[PDB]
Each structure stands twice: as C-alpha cells, then as structure tokens.
Ligand SMILES: COc1nccnc1C(C)C
C-alpha cells in the first residue's frame with residue numbers, strides 16, 4: 713500500500729527509522745552537485761508528535777560530517793518546514809513505507825527559490841523500476857532527468 717503525507721490515509725509513524733539517499737533532483741542542479749549544500753545523505757528519520765528529526769551526513773573531500781535537523785509540522789497536513797540554508801517546506805508525495813520514500817521540497821533563500829526532490833530507500837539502493845517511478849514524479853514537477861542525480865554508488869562513508 714502507498715500513501716502521500718498530504719493524503720487522509722497517511723501514517724507518519726510508518727516512515728520512522730532507517731533511510732538512505734538514493735537519488736536527488738533539483739531545478740537548480742548546483743544545489744545537489746559535489747559541493748552543494750543540499751547533497752545530503754539521509755540516515756534516519758525519527759518521528760515525533762509534531763516533528764521529524766532528520767539525521768544526515770554530508771561529504772567534503774571524501775570526508776563525512778554528521779548533520780541533524782528538526783522539521784516541524786506546519787498548518788497544512790503532511791507538510792513540514794525546516795530552517796537550513798534558507799527556509800524549506802516539504803511534503804512526501806509518495807511512499808510505500810517499506811521500500812521507498814519520495815520527498816518534494818521548496819527552498820527559499822535571499823528572495824529566490826528552487827525545487828528539490830529526493831528518493832530515499834530502506835536499503836542503500838532501490839530497484840530500477842522504483843527509480844523510474846521517481847523520474848516520472850520529477851517530470852510531473854518540471855525537473856528534467858539531466859537534473860536527477862543517482863547517488864547510490866556514493867551514499868556510504
Ligand atoms: C533539508 O532537507 C533535505 N535536503 C536534502 C535532501 N533531503 C532533504 C529532506 C527532504 C529529507
């Protein structure tokens with residue numbers, strides 16, 4: 713069974729736990745390239761009453777650094793906000809809880825904005841069919857495949 717965070721049948725507790733960044737995408741590709749601030753490797757999501765504690769690691773010169781961030785629920789169901797290199801809001805348009813999680817984020821910094829989409833897996837990689845489903849969701853948001861970066865060959869420290 714699949715659900716969206718914005719949907720009536722969403723069960724937020726079910727996204728608690730281990731996750732790995734499999735693919736990232738953006739309509740501002742530099743944000744997720746090598747030294748981009750949004751090239752984040754998710755490790756776990758801790759579900760709380762009104763927030764999600766996101767644990768990531770970033771990479772610089774082949775060196776991993778831990779980074780934790782707290783996302784608060786906003787006034788719209790299924791939407792979360794978090795301060796990180798600007799003001800961010802995100803939703804989970806599709807997840808099956810047991811294999812994948814697809815997030816759609818809007819960042820706003822210095823009066824600008826960009827979209828980020830992420831595909832996270834319970835294991836360090838996902839099937840090619842789920843990766844294709846993610847590409848389809850990115851296309852629905854006007855993000856070209858050339859702006860989608862598979863990081864499955866580089867998500868471990
Ligand atoms: C700040 O939020 C993020 N940044 C980069 C990748 N993924 C995320 C969360 C949406 C999980």
Ligand code: NA
Pocket residue numbers: 788
């Ligand atoms: Na809104």
Ligand code: NA
Pocket residue numbers: 805816
């Ligand atoms: Na959407």
Ligand code: NA
Pocket residue numbers: 803816817
């Ligand atoms: Na959205």
